[PDB]
Symmetry: D2
Subunit: 113 residues, 4 copies
């Protein structure tokens, strides 16, 4: 199945947070309606936090893309709703051979405020 | 039910990341085996990222507590495993009356590296 | 937080499946827009399957209620989305003192077909 | 990533429940330590419940395979833990072209009793 693709509520602001656990530099792009809207990059094996950016969901079509060594990483993803209110969309990724799926971890959350 | 309580693998390094969406200052405490082992404080309504800390799980008994206004916030939590490998333990919290459950969001993840 | 309450897409058919793991007889009622729409009951400690019923979500306001020994059980719940398509809303419940939260397990899924 | 593969506690009894939403007959196989240990077959587009079977996890290595039309279906999966106690491992699957991922839905849960 496709992974890293989520349908958000339309026209909502959401946060994107990235953690890295890799020796290879990670490059994360968030697409909204097939257009690039947020970029992150970094490297480190200590759950290193690349920060959070807030962007708008447009029609709702959000895709997470993660590249390392020039290749798009293998993605795994899920969406969780807590208390019928807090939404988290999570992406793990694998850039190599050890199948740890933590090389970049991308977390989307909404609503904010 | 109790919320914000997780059993991790023993003696594992794990990351704790905190996001806030609040006007009241948030205080997050992470306990390992009932001992206070990580703290975060901050405020802001736009998904303010308070960073990530890496700590060890001890016997495995990890608990998240969140306060604001000198009072414990109401917690909701779940654990997710992706690719049979990437673990996320998520806590949402409510400090007030609007039931948005985003006032502090605490993410635990393992394994690292 | 309230547990066992989910917002479904409006006017959608969804399935409700119940498993029991209890010595006490379990009584499950599913409410849609505050009206009773599906009932299940049974007893057994072997993950005993009470079957599946398909009902309609109305405005979308769905609540799971679980009673044993005349008392509403303590609920825990979450919603999961897989492949940006398959939705599962899960409720565990505790009727007693052992905190196993399996006494009735209620699974909602959509879309069908 | 591999999907439908889960590590359970060793030597634990767990339940497997299958729902189908398909016009093609579904065949679900559960492997424990690479040995074929539970089977289900059925068909129907209205969330047809094929029942629950209880089996033992052996060393803990559990795999779900789903076929229809003599071919392995595309799998998507996650594991959820509620109340730090109730485990659900969920598999959705697609046998065709409509990408609804509900053709067989396989739910594993533990602990029982
Ligand atoms: C050297 O190992 C690390 O870096 C590689 C990328 O080179 C990752 O895939 C792996 O999981 C480790 O984090
Ligand atoms: C003023 O409203 C904000 O701040 C309060 C107190 O932190 C939160 O409960 C609420 O959800 C908003 O984020
Ligand atoms: C006797 O123990 C069982 O039944 C009680 C209800 O009596 C449940 O709470 C418990 O988890 C067991 O399933
Ligand atoms: C005819 O359409 C149905 O049957 C096929 C084959 O099982 C499924 O892929 C599809 O989602 C529908 O449930
Ligand atoms: Ca890796
Ligand atoms: Ca890694
Ligand atoms: Ca709030
Ligand atoms: Ca808030
Ligand atoms: Ca119980
Ligand atoms: Ca029980
Ligand atoms: Ca299909
Ligand atoms: Ca189908």
């Amino acid at each position: 199945a496709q992974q890293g693709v989520f349908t958000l509520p339309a026209r909502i602001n959401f946060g994107v947070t990235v953690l890295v656990n890799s020796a290879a530099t990670q490059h994360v792009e968030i697409f909204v309606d097939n257009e690039p809207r947020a970029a992150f990059s970094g490297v480190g094996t200590g759950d290193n936090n690349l920060g959070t950016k807030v962007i708008n969901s447009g029609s709702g079509n959000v895709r997470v893309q993660i590249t390392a060594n020039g290749r798009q990483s293998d993605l795994v993803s899920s969406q969780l709703v807590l208390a019928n209110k807090l939404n988290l969309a999570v992406v793990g990724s694998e850039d190599g051979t050890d199948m740890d799926y933590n090389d970049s971890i991308v977390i989307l959350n909404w609503p904010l405020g």
